[PDB]
Amino acid sequence: KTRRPDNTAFKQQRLPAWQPILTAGTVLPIFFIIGLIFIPIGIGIFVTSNNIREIEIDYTGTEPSSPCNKCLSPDVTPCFCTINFTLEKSFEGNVFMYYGLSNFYQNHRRYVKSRDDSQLNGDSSALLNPSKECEPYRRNEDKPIAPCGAIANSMFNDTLELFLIGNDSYPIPIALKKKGIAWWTDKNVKFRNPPGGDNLEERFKGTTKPVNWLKPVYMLDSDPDNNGFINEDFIVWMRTAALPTFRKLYRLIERKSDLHPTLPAGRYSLNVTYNYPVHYFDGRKRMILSTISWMGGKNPFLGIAYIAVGSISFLLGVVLLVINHKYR
Amino acid sequence: TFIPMNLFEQFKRAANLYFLALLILQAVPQISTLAWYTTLVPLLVVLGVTAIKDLVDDVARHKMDKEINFKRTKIDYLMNYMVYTIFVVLILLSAGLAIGHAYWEAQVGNSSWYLYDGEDDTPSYRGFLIFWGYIIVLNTMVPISLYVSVEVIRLGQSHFINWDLQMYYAEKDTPAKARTTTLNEQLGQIHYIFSDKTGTLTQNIMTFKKCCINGQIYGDHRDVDFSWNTYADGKLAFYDHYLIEQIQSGKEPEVRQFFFLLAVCHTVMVDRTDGQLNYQAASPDEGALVNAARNFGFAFLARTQNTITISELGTERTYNVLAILDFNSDRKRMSIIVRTPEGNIKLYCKGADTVIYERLHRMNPTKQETQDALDIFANETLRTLCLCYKEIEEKEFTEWNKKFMAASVASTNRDEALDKVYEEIEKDLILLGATAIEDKLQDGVPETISKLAKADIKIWVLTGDKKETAENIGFACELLTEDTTICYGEDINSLLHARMENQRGNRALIITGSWLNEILLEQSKRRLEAKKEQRQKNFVDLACECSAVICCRVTPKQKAMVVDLVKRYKKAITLAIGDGANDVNMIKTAHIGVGISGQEGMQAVMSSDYSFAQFRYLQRLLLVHGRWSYIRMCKFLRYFFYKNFAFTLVHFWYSFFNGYSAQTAYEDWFITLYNVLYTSLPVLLMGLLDQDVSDKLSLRFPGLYIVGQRDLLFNYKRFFVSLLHGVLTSMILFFIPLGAYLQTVGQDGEAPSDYQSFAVTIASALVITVNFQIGLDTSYWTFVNAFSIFGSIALYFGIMFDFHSAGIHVLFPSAFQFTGTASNALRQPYIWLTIILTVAVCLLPVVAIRFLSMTIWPSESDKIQKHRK
Numbered sequence A: 001k002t003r004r005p006d007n008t009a010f011k012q013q014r015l016p017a018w019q020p021i022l023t024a025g026t027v028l029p030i031f032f033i034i035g036l037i038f039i040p041i042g043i044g045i046f047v048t049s050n051n052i053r054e055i056e057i058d059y060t061g062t063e064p065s066s067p068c069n070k071c072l073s074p075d076v077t078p079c080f081c082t083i084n085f086t087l088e089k090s091f092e093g094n095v096f097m098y099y100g101l102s103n104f105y106q107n108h109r110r111y112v113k114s115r116d117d118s119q120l121n122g123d124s125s126a127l128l129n130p131s132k133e134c135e136p137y138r139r140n141e142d143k144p145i146a147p148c149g150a151i152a153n154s155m156f157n158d159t160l161e162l163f164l165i166g167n168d169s170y171p172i173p174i175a176l177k178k179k180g181i182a183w184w185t186d187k188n189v190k191f192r193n194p195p196g197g198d199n200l201e202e203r204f205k206g207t208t209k210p211v212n213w214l215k216p217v218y219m220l221d222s223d224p225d226n227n228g229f230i231n232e233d234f235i236v237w238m239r240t241a242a243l244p245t246f247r248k249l250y251r252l253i254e255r256k257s258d259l260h261p262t263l264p265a266g267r268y269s270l271n272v273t274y275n276y277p278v279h280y281f282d283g284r285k286r287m288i289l290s291t292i293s294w295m296g297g298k299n300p301f302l303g304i305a306y307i308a309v310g311s312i313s314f315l316l317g318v319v320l321l322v323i324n325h326k327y328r
Numbered sequence B: 001t002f003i004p005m006n007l008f009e010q011f012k013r014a015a016n017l018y019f020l021a022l023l024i025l026q027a028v029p030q031i032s033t034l035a036w037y038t039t040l041v042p043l044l045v046v047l048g049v050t051a052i053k054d055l056v057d058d059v060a061r062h063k064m065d066k067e068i069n070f071k072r073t074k075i076d077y078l079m080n081y082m083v084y085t086i087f088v089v090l091i092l093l094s095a096g097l098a099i100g101h102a103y104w105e106a107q108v109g110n111s112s113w114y115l116y117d118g119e120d121d122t123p124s125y126r127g128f129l130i131f132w133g134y135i136i137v138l139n140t141m142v143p144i145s146l147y148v149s150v151e152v153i154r155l156g157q158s159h160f161i162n163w164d165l166q167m168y169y170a171e172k173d174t175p176a177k178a179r180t181t182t183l184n185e186q187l188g189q190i191h192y193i194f195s196d197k198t199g200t201l202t203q204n205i206m207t208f209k210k211c212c213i214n215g216q217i218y219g220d221h222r223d224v225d226f227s228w229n230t231y232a233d234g235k236l237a238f239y240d241h242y243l244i245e246q247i248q249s250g251k252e253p254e255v256r257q258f259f260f261l262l263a264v265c266h267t268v269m270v271d272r273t274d275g276q277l278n279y280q281a282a283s284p285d286e287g288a289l290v291n292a293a294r295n296f297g298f299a300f301l302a303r304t305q306n307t308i309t310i311s312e313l314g315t316e317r318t319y320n321v322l323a324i325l326d327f328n329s330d331r332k333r334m335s336i337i338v339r340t341p342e343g344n345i346k347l348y349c350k351g352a353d354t355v356i357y358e359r360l361h362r363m364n365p366t367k368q369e370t371q372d373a374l375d376i377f378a379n380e381t382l383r384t385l386c387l388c389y390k391e392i393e394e395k396e397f398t399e400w401n402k403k404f405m406a407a408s409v410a411s412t413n414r415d416e417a418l419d420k421v422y423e424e425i426e427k428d429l430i431l432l433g434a435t436a437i438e439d440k441l442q443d444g445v446p447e448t449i450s451k452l453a454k455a456d457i458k459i460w461v462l463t464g465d466k467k468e469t470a471e472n473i474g475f476a477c478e479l480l481t482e483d484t485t486i487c488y489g490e491d492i493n494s495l496l497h498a499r500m501e502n503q504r505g506n507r508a509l510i511i512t513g514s515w516l517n518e519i520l521l522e523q524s525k526r527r528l529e530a531k532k533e534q535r536q537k538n539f540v541d542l543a544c545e546c547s548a549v550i551c552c553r554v555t556p557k558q559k560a561m562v563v564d565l566v567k568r569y570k571k572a573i574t575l576a577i578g579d580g581a582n583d584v585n586m587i588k589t590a591h592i593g594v595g596i597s598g599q600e601g602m603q604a605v606m607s608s609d610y611s612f613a614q615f616r617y618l619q620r621l622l623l624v625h626g627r628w629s630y631i632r633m634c635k636f637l638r639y640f641f642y643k644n645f646a647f648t649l650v651h652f653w654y655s656f657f658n659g660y661s662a663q664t665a666y667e668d669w670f671i672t673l674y675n676v677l678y679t680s681l682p683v684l685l686m687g688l689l690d691q692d693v694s695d696k697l698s699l700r701f702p703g704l705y706i707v708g709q710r711d712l713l714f715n716y717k718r719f720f721v722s723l724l725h726g727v728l729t730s731m732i733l734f735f736i737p738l739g740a741y742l743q744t745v746g747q748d749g750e751a752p753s754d755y756q757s758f759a760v761t762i763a764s765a766l767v768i769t770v771n772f773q774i775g776l777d778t779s780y781w782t783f784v785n786a787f788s789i790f791g792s793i794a795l796y797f798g799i800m801f802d803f804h805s806a807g808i809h810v811l812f813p814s815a816f817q818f819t820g821t822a823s824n825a826l827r828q829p830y831i832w833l834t835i836i837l838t839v840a841v842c843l844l845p846v847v848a849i850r851f852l853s854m855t856i857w858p859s860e861s862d863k864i865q866k867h868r869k
Ligand SMILES: *[C@@H]1O[C@H](CO)[C@@H](O[C@@H]2O[C@H](CO)[C@@H](O[C@@H]3O[C@H](CO)[C@@H](O)[C@H](O)[C@@H]3O)[C@H](O)[C@H]2NC(C)=O)[C@H](O)[C@H]1NC(C)=O
Pocket: A154, A155, A157, A211, A212, A213, A214, A215, A275, A276, A277, B113
């Protein structure tokens, strides 16, 4: 028919190769070294997580006997809820200011798509031509809503404030910083304001606010570096969470100059401007104060998991020896 | 034009139209959940390169035509049913989660002000609209890049058959061929094989050794190079001086014309320009038998359109040949009518005893002494032919020649008259005996028959030939041994009848095709139609349980018929190694067609799937190429459905935690490239290089073939195991980050706890989990297999950063939206400490069950592979 097939390892199916065989001497140790590294890391995660001092406060006021049940029906729009809490152990290092929303599905298919991301990117065409993605919130009456979308519309708009009640009983306000809550990339890369101009007013012409927002997106923050679509709270909000019960970094508390703890143990009061209704759909709202750990944050699931799988790796490892010895 | 190529590429295949039906489904913005990119881009690749792999053939044909001037796979049938099984399961869940979402839009959807917007929408109507979303979002449950990958796996695996140096003949220069690059996995699933026994189990190198004349045996040492005349060119060391001197002088008439018949009744292309008087015979028997005559002086000089210059002892006597009764495989004989210069007309005939004994004279002295001779010849693998003549009065030739002239005119059709005219005069003939010529088994055939038999491939030999040459050759190639009990066909009629009124190491049997159809029997009609069909299927059950059965005296028409029966009425996978024009029929019938080059025409070669030169090469075709091809093929499937079911089903679980709304748990582009870029290479290379054992060890242990035939390594259940193990895996990829995402996962100034980082972590733990899964699957870790796996994972991470880089965002902000998610999710020790956890939780139980299953139930390869020798 044809000439000789040229003799090569590839064509003759005799390439050089290693034949990894799963003997006892190769599977048993990988199990233990996993079981002897998942336990100590699991212990490391767990102890550090339990070493993180944290306090969680639920201020939705839906249950009776809470002293802001009045805010469930704000006959007058601004309703203020006050909660007193005491810190048993001082926080060391900077402390993170949070908020949470339980049973709030920010990840709904219809909900997530509702965003003209190109318009969140400051695309001049996208402002006056919101995508069909944010169809129901394209326009208010005649002109299109710039922060279009259900998500941008439905922005968590409370104001959680922390006051330290000293021995004199006079509230001492606690410093909270509104910068550096979002990622570096999101501030400068994903989320951008429109092009040109100097003032955000003239830049957002021919566009109304979302129906839910009380005020336009022009002056969301006094600082010009944190107003508009680069608003820190917006970026944290709009950057949809992965679960119904989620948590979001609200503000920062950096370390005080003095050697004293950032949040000394004592009695503190939480004065929140209730503005977000979550009782309609069995939702909640929370505030969480947490101190930094050099190895991430309080994640008992990972710590408990590594103990759990790390042990099972050892239990799997010690199980395998008997079968090997019996069938030697 | 190239547009017609894709038109039929879509309609015939179950899934190629599926994803076309889906593309319009994602086209309308009403139900646009997953963009058309998700299906269009992987649809072009699967349809694009698949056309390229076949466009080369068409381009080749166009060139060859200008300057000069259907088999389907068992695996193919399953995959079509699997896509249907994905269709029902996908739509079952698309409605199975429509009930769950139906409530959610009423209880939680109505009150949830952040979702309601002011358009009247019933809780069940919202369930209807999403029912398209569930279909769309989980569209990639059906593997888009399957049909492309199957073709590439077979095309590569077919070229190893062609390229094998150990299936390449030396003197003929005839490498193996894979004509049909479409059924490679079947070579590993072969249950039955079929052969011709001439050119298949023999060399076709025929050298005259013995013959029978007047019932006497000639060719035995008694009473020796041929140096007495110029015609008898010395190339055949003969013996039996009696025969040598019997022709020198005192020639008997019967002995005289005997060698004359060999030199006249034939169709060779005689040569005289060389001066050596060569022969070039289209059929091996005529060429060798004619050469015997010249060695004995009866040399054939030349032939013209109607005259022949045959010579005898230098007495060049020219006969006028008027008609030729050609040989075709169906008639199994040849005859010739010639006019002697004296004035008479002489008729000579030759061929098999069966079709010539049906036309014996009323009584001949050479009848029984001939009959007891051929078996003696055939008892040691001699191809014996009966040679007989007749002289007819001129009056007999008168009426017999007009009907030729009627049949001689070509016109549009001339095929039936020639059949009837040949038979009627030939019914009576005068016999001499029968010749005999040896064709020895080609080397290595006993090995392959022995080796394949231990691989549990049932081997049958189909041949219109002696029921003795193959029966004696069978023991000469290990086809049959002492244990098997070959019995004649008389008992089969009684035994097969006996079981019928009841209903109203190896086994073998010896039967004849002339009698084979009697078993098949080739209100009463319906009863009788099922009467023979019950015998038909039952007999094939008496045959299917056999690794050696002698089905012989079967014509071309009866070759394909037998391959039909077991192929249809057993569903067993059939290969056929064949020879000559006579076997082109069955080689089409069998699932795999194989044809040996031989020396009887490139007919079976050109009407086959995989063709090579020697039967011994059948070893590496099945035990090395077919066996690896199946393991390479159906290990690809197990990983290929797995990698997709474990891929989409994150959509299922993430649906429970987003209002059952069918949200994408992955980046938009992670669905496109997953089937074509992130898991396509390592499974393909495994599909071309995965040797569970070495080629030398593959032939040393034929027992590894049991996997393909029994189809153990892949079943219908193993499809769901790849689903359930994909359900379990999809949970782990989803819930392990979920538990790590419910709490803080390193929340700081750079606090990744969002959905995008949730998607990246799931994607990262996916490719590593599956690309380590294929790494945990490859038994033959070549430096390219290792490159494919780590290159695949490196490829996933390599372009993810590009996809997540700030540069691509400006390119397509609305389509490439994940930005800095990996760079903000893969720098956290917690996330990697979670990906390691998710990857570990994904693989350690897999490693544990692979080891545990390997320990409690070691595989055939495993037991063989534990040793270094
Ligand atoms: C803080 O966010 C909440 C969202 O939970 C805002 O409540 C929403 O306010 C808008 C109007 O600002 C309501 O839309 C419509 O208001 C008109 C009156 O202008 C009323 O007639 C309509 O029936 C409709 O309510 C919207 O309904 C309301 N949200 C809900 C769940 O009812 C709130 O205004 C925001 N406040 C601040 C200070 O940001």
